[PDB]
Amino acid sequence: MVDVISNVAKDPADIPGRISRSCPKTVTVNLVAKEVVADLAPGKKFWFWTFAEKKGDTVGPATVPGPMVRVMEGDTVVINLTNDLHNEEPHNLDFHAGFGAMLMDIEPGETDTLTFKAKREGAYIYHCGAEGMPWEHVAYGMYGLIVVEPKGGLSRVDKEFYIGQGEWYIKPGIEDHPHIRGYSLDEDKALAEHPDYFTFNGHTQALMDPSIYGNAITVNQGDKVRLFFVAGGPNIGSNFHIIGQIFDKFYPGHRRDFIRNEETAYIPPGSAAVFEFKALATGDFLIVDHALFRVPKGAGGLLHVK
Amino acid sequence: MVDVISNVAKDPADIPGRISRSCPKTVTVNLVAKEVVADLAPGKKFWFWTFAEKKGDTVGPATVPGPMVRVMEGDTVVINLTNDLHNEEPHNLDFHAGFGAMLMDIEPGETDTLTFKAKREGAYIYHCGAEGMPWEHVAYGMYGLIVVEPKGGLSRVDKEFYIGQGEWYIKPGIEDHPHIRGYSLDEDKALAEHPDYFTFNGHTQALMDPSIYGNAITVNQGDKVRLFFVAGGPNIGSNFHIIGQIFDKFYPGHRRDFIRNEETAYIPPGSAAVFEFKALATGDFLIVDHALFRVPKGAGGLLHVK
Amino acid sequence: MVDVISNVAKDPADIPGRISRSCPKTVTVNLVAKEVVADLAPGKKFWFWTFAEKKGDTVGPATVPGPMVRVMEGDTVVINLTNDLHNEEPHNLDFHAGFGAMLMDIEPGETDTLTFKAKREGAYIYHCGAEGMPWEHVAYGMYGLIVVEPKGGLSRVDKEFYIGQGEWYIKPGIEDHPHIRGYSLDEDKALAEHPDYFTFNGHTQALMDPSIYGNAITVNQGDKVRLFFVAGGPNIGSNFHIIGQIFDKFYPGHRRDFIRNEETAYIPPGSAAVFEFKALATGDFLIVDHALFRVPKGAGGLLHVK
Amino acid sequence: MVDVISNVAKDPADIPGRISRSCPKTVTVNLVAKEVVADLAPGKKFWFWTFAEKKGDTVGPATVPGPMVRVMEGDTVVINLTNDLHNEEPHNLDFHAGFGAMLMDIEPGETDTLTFKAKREGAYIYHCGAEGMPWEHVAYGMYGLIVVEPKGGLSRVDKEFYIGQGEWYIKPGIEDHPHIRGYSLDEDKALAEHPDYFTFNGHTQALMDPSIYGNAITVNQGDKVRLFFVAGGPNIGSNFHIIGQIFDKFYPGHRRDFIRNEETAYIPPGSAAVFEFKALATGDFLIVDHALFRVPKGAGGLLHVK
Amino acid sequence: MVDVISNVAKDPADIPGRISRSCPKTVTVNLVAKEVVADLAPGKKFWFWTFAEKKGDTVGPATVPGPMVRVMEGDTVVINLTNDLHNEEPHNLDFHAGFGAMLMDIEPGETDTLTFKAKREGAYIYHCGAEGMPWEHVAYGMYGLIVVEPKGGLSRVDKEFYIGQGEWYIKPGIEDHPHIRGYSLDEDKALAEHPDYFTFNGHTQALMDPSIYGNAITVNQGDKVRLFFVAGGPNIGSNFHIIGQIFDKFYPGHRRDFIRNEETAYIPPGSAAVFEFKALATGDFLIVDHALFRVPKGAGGLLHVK
Amino acid sequence: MVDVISNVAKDPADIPGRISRSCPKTVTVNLVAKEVVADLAPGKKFWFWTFAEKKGDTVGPATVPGPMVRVMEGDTVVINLTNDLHNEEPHNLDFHAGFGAMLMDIEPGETDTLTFKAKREGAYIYHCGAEGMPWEHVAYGMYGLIVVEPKGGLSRVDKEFYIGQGEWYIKPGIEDHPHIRGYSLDEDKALAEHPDYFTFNGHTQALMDPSIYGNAITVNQGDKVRLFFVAGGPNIGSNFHIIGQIFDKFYPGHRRDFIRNEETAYIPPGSAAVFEFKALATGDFLIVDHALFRVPKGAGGLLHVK
Ligand SMILES: [Ca+2]
Ligand SMILES: [Ca+2]
Ligand SMILES: [Ca+2]
Ligand SMILES: [Ca+2]
Ligand SMILES: [Ca+2]
Ligand SMILES: [Ca+2]
Ligand SMILES: [Cu+2]
Ligand SMILES: [Cu+2]
Ligand SMILES: [Cu+2]
Ligand SMILES: [Cu+2]
Ligand SMILES: [Cu+2]
Ligand SMILES: [Cu+2]
Ligand SMILES: [Cu+2]
Ligand SMILES: [Cu+2]
Ligand SMILES: [Cu+2]
Ligand SMILES: [Cu+2]
Ligand SMILES: [Cu+2]
Ligand SMILES: [Cu+2]
């Protein structure tokens, strides 16, 4: 029987450590595909397909976006994916950071390993592309961010965070688990690109609710901040912008190629990027897609400066 | 009782003077938030929320986009905002050009001053973000462009213009002023991102009608032209392009970071940018968003070369 | 009476030869506007307005996107357009690569020549803008790509291809040719930006069907690949991305201005660009817009690496 | 009767203040041409022609190289030159930092003003070019350094110093002042480019003797150091290098154009340049021209790191 | 019997025409090696070995430096060298602009052709390297400048000039032509690098004497000036500098690689370079090597600004 | 008693292996200071002070320039210097590649280790600076080249070589070893900068004599060649140039900062640099300082292309 948890919100501080090395290495991460029911919005239970990071023998939590992977250019990257036994649909990986870096569909219970070399630096998206239906798998929340830093790592910053944006089309009733009163993917609404809710880090109120990481992204005044951003979509890009903030550096792919002083950057679906800004002003600031009516739909977050 | 004027179209030549100085200064502008009824489209009266520039004791006209602000990097910028006495909803400022450069909601009648230092160069958007509902306030037309030029100013050009694009969702009847037969904002159409009309400089026929600035943007052949462009949205970006024209320089944020020879540039909502092109061909040329069915809806302008 | 052919799919290998010269020249191409009925999707006949390239006395085939034009910066470009006698609506050219490079509407039967100098390098779109209704003419498939290479030509690559993306709004019945059972343009669906099908190179299954250029784009492992890409629209841009591939170079307009290591690039409607990537991984790879539900609608292609 | 002082050594710390402004200004300096007898080397009295800086009503000391002038690009530079009453030969100015920035020969007693605009940034040499014999006038020590910093000034550093290198050809006996037992310029040795002594800051032991600025150039470990360097010549350039030090930045003329990590830089006679290096190692370090036998001849200084 | 002419001074305006083409071509020049007696200095007859340019059937004059060659990058360069019948020593060519671009020693009377492709842009020196003794042949004045401009040519300028610097060691008596009372090369003085005279364009007073090209280099105020400079040596480089002038651009080899705002540039012997400066100041200005005692020896020229 | 060998010529192919790693390491080299008598020129025995590289238990040969050291930026460099027991004067190291990277004078017999971090990339000189008389120690031949390559190493080339230039002042008789008939350093000639011989790699005929490395530097046509060059001096720089060759890249200190297409580059004494060129022409080519009378004095080498 399916697990039913409060939410799949991803902490935007659960980030691997900064890179200060030039020696290539074999970086290795353990992932587990987890089908879960949880609140998408307040009062709305949704059937999620998520990624969870396994450390040692311990696993979870299940989140949207998935766990942030972090490596250096020239490293060898090993992702062990497991498909939980209590899942329904099969799953697999697809890393934009690698050349032909896709796994083969693994059945619930089986576990396979994906090995690939990260030979192009940048922020990339990774996702579930199983059954040749990447649309359906991403739509349910199976997407995360991988960053390949250059040799020596990116310029050091005071605080760093991770945000994944996505849109959701909800149909009441789940085909499986009919006992559960909650929503399932809507093909029609999805095909028509007419979403109901927008989410930052897997929840409509995530980054807006103190209980659900509402004060999670907080920085001291005068700090340099870096933001690893993904647009999971699966259809709508993000006109990303933070109120009262100016992006000193913006690079979608390479550190060297960037625009200075961007206010709002269009991040297309299925793409990741890096934002850099100094927190020169104190107080609360609203993180939002600048398609503003999107914000009421949940494209709304909160940055704190002390 | 509400004022009812023909239109809120903004002259795309009402531009402050070019900057040729390196001495920082305290540049100061007087704004007044003005709720007005006027033609959005021919035969359609709409309830606008606009910005107007006050010179000396004289104010107006009320326009969309709002008045262009123009400063140098390192200047100190002072905006005195006034909320007219005959307004309904409260208002405030939000400048993308400044760090935590937001005012506090001022009530109809009261007047506050916003002081901020412009320490990042570029073209930025400013707007009304009052009542924590920037979507509603921008949707009614409360958006304008500010440019922070580098020290010495941008490279001199023969002719310069100012264009703000926006989309509108209209509901017949205004909740207030029921006597007026005209349209008010539609939450549903707005939330669904399905606009009825598109406008350049606050009117569907603005830049297309000789009476309403139709021949306003005219330049001599062989001239260098610069265009300060804003995408007010509040939801739809602009695939900006001018027929028979090639953009020699395009920079969304910094002068140094630009692409040469762009044909169509995506300007996301809540963003401003600078276009530069030589008028090497004579005659009439259609300024349009390149989502072409948008053009019938009003995303259509006119450039004249003599 | 109208011609009725199986499809208007464009071979993504029918490309002019690479440029290795610095001597400017007068490059000349013969085009013929061809109204045709053909399969848009399997089982759906659509009324197309296309461009065809005339070599010597021989013409055709009629395709979407139109024939790729290819010149050097400083060349003199001569396009002879002919409007077939059995056409209905008038037509003309509009080249984004030239300054005021638009023809005048030519009637079915008449033939005019467009001469222009290509003095800005880059990948550009060209299209039919006749009757002052570029939306209607582009919507029916009258769009192609022109590239102006720098002097010496772009860096040489092993394999090169040409892809035009577009979206379609279909209404059953053609106003003309009522005898034909097939679909015509839908103003309403088009104005609302709610397309039914998406196409790569003029067909929903083109680049997916072995019969219809399905294995057309095939390259040997370790090859450098260049892709000339257009977004015909006429309303929807393309979040272009190829699965298992990383773009080493991406330039929308100038060769010099580009971003390294892009995964997904937003190509706005009415714009063309150049993608460059090494085929370091073997096997099949899905070419798609990353608005993934678009892929089921036909935004789906196939790249083969041996 | 001539003045006879111990030495004309220039303190390499008597430097104007750093520039942190972008507002152009009229910077003004008062100079006085001073013929003096002093020790060139220990036990060798030489007849010097020097420049001295007049502050307020007070003047002196007389030094080689002359006083460092320091301005910003776009400033207006005013140099009042005075030729002392007890001088013999006439004198004038010649600034490499200005376009046609030469005075006219002023007679002993008379005083003229040189006004010029500094519209090209960089480190330049200035000198006495009177009587159309710049060789004779420079040979006697009439040379100094002027730097035109960019707007905003050069990047700030912890410690800054000023060094002028020169070579000397000495003939016993002065034509004038026969009573004095000391040396005068040797035409023959000078014409043959065979100097006897080399000097840093006007003395053979200057920068080597604690009494004569020997510990004058001292910096704390980990400090950033900037060095304003002139090669007075008048015939021999300087293969400038500091032992145990690496120049992180070296620019002869423009800040932007520089080589990173230079060990020894050739500074041609009649040229000035800027060296930048971090003092990462403690202890004493020998400043020298790398024509090493030059060092015994006096091309030898001392840098201290604590 | 040997010819005896007044001087071998080269007009610094006898320059080929500017290049405004990108089409490679086969540029061809006819040279004739001419041994001549003439004034090196006033009252001093010297035995010169020079190059002369043959146009059509007409040849001469014989000059130092030799005739300026001027081509575009990618051209094919053909130099027909002739060794006059009344010469003594054999001669040949050696172009620094070409890969293995050396002729074979041609005997007096015989004529050979040198063909080479100019595939690296820049200013280069060419000279006589015959008998494996390039020192002896260059010492007598057999050196000239070749420039390979990029495709399109260098940026256009108002006025352009050509200057070759050299030093001379003179021995009274010529081994051949004993009847002539004049000077021949001195091995000892030459080997010891102790020259007697310095020359600009083959004469000590050339560029200083109105009769001998003294007012030859004259430009209008506000003009852009370009200078093609060679350092023939054969031993001493030139600390080139023009009084009252600042070099806006200086490139020894490639147009792209240059330093801005140089005052004095060291040009090593056997090297050529390009100087660029605006003539913003009127009047007379002294062109000189900044080894100033060199100027009395003849390293002295004259620039006029009106 | 002193050793007496034929010559101290250094093989310009005895070069450490190319670097293809980014992992910092502790690179370690064993040096031994060796006083030796040998032929400077044919028939002239000179008293040399040289460096020799000790591999394992085996040492020698003794050469000028000393052994080439080769490391990566960020490595830790360990040089064990030994002063042979049969030496007279004490010795020490001085690396331009390190911050305060000087040893203390070690007595004949004693052995010390120099540890330093190479944190600035480039080609540098190292030498003996013992007894505070670097002039005397370098003059006798105690100088070599160290290169700090960037992470990943310099771009790979087909063939690589090592050349050290120097000048010599010789006095007959050695103060020590009076039995030996040969020459010792001349203070006077040295102080006056009037050298007798010039040498490439420690011998006048080295690189010119088949027996003494005359055909040592040989490369196949079409090969890319890199040259690590030092100017030991100790007084005269090198106007380095190779006949029939063009330097595609020239960097004195940093790989990034370089000039393209240099013909002759001035390398000041006490400096090292990197030259890069393609061997597009076959046959013999003369390597020389372009102060051509220097070539007869021994500044003459030989490059072979097959
Ligand atoms: Ca990315
Ligand atoms: Ca902007
Ligand atoms: Ca383009
Ligand atoms: Ca300078
Ligand atoms: Ca050159
Ligand atoms: Ca170096
Ligand atoms: Cu899945
Ligand atoms: Cu993807
Ligand atoms: Cu408002
Ligand atoms: Cu905003
Ligand atoms: Cu048409
Ligand atoms: Cu178009
Ligand atoms: Cu004087
Ligand atoms: Cu000077
Ligand atoms: Cu000759
Ligand atoms: Cu040469
Ligand atoms: Cu020693
Ligand atoms: Cu040294």
Side-chain angles (χ1 to χ4, degrees), chain B residues 22-24 151, chain D residues 22-24 151:
Chain B
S22 306
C23 271
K151 303 215 178 181
Chain D
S22 306
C23 271
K151 303 215 178 181

PDB file of all heavy atoms in Angstrom, chain B residues 22-24 151, chain D residues 22-24 151:
ATOM      1  N   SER B  22      30.327  62.061 -16.303  1.00  0.00           N
ATOM      2  CA  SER B  22      30.838  61.038 -15.381  1.00  0.00           C
ATOM      3  C   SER B  22      30.664  61.413 -13.904  1.00  0.00           C
ATOM      4  O   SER B  22      30.822  60.555 -13.032  1.00  0.00           O
ATOM      5  CB  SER B  22      32.312  60.773 -15.676  1.00  0.00           C
ATOM      6  OG  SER B  22      32.494  60.441 -17.041  1.00  0.00           O
ATOM      7  N   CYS B  23      30.350  62.681 -13.629  1.00  0.00           N
ATOM      8  CA  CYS B  23      30.093  63.147 -12.267  1.00  0.00           C
ATOM      9  C   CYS B  23      28.776  62.602 -11.730  1.00  0.00           C
ATOM     10  O   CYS B  23      27.715  62.966 -12.239  1.00  0.00           O
ATOM     11  CB  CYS B  23      30.048  64.683 -12.202  1.00  0.00           C
ATOM     12  SG  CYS B  23      31.650  65.457 -11.892  1.00  0.00           S
ATOM     13  N   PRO B  24      28.828  61.748 -10.686  1.00  0.00           N
ATOM     14  CA  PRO B  24      27.547  61.347 -10.104  1.00  0.00           C
ATOM     15  C   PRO B  24      26.739  62.551  -9.608  1.00  0.00           C
ATOM     16  O   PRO B  24      27.301  63.609  -9.309  1.00  0.00           O
ATOM     17  CB  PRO B  24      27.945  60.433  -8.937  1.00  0.00           C
ATOM     18  CG  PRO B  24      29.351  60.018  -9.215  1.00  0.00           C
ATOM     19  CD  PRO B  24      29.969  61.162  -9.956  1.00  0.00           C
ATOM     20  N   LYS B 151      28.997  55.226 -16.712  1.00  0.00           N
ATOM     21  CA  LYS B 151      29.640  56.532 -16.593  1.00  0.00           C
ATOM     22  C   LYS B 151      30.133  56.954 -17.971  1.00  0.00           C
ATOM     23  O   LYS B 151      30.806  56.185 -18.655  1.00  0.00           O
ATOM     24  CB  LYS B 151      30.793  56.505 -15.591  1.00  0.00           C
ATOM     25  CG  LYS B 151      30.368  56.044 -14.209  1.00  0.00           C
ATOM     26  CD  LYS B 151      31.115  56.737 -13.081  1.00  0.00           C
ATOM     27  CE  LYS B 151      30.527  56.191 -11.768  1.00  0.00           C
ATOM     28  NZ  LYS B 151      30.991  56.659 -10.430  1.00  0.00           N
TER      29      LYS B 151
ATOM     30  N   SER D  22      35.239  59.885  -9.933  1.00  0.00           N
ATOM     31  CA  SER D  22      34.963  59.916 -11.375  1.00  0.00           C
ATOM     32  C   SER D  22      34.712  61.330 -11.914  1.00  0.00           C
ATOM     33  O   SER D  22      34.710  61.531 -13.130  1.00  0.00           O
ATOM     34  CB  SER D  22      33.765  59.025 -11.687  1.00  0.00           C
ATOM     35  OG  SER D  22      33.972  57.718 -11.183  1.00  0.00           O
ATOM     36  N   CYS D  23      34.496  62.295 -11.016  1.00  0.00           N
ATOM     37  CA  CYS D  23      34.310  63.693 -11.400  1.00  0.00           C
ATOM     38  C   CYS D  23      35.609  64.313 -11.897  1.00  0.00           C
ATOM     39  O   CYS D  23      36.545  64.473 -11.113  1.00  0.00           O
ATOM     40  CB  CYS D  23      33.790  64.531 -10.219  1.00  0.00           C
ATOM     41  SG  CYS D  23      31.990  64.592 -10.090  1.00  0.00           S
ATOM     42  N   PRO D  24      35.671  64.689 -13.192  1.00  0.00           N
ATOM     43  CA  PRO D  24      36.877  65.405 -13.609  1.00  0.00           C
ATOM     44  C   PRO D  24      37.094  66.687 -12.800  1.00  0.00           C
ATOM     45  O   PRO D  24      36.146  67.253 -12.246  1.00  0.00           O
ATOM     46  CB  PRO D  24      36.620  65.724 -15.089  1.00  0.00           C
ATOM     47  CG  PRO D  24      35.533  64.795 -15.516  1.00  0.00           C
ATOM     48  CD  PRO D  24      34.699  64.564 -14.296  1.00  0.00           C
ATOM     49  N   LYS D 151      38.972  56.609 -14.832  1.00  0.00           N
ATOM     50  CA  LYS D 151      37.895  57.129 -13.992  1.00  0.00           C
ATOM     51  C   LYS D 151      37.551  56.078 -12.944  1.00  0.00           C
ATOM     52  O   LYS D 151      37.338  54.913 -13.275  1.00  0.00           O
ATOM     53  CB  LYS D 151      36.662  57.494 -14.817  1.00  0.00           C
ATOM     54  CG  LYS D 151      36.956  58.503 -15.910  1.00  0.00           C
ATOM     55  CD  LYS D 151      35.814  59.473 -16.165  1.00  0.00           C
ATOM     56  CE  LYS D 151      36.301  60.444 -17.256  1.00  0.00           C
ATOM     57  NZ  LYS D 151      35.459  61.568 -17.758  1.00  0.00           N
TER      58      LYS D 151
END
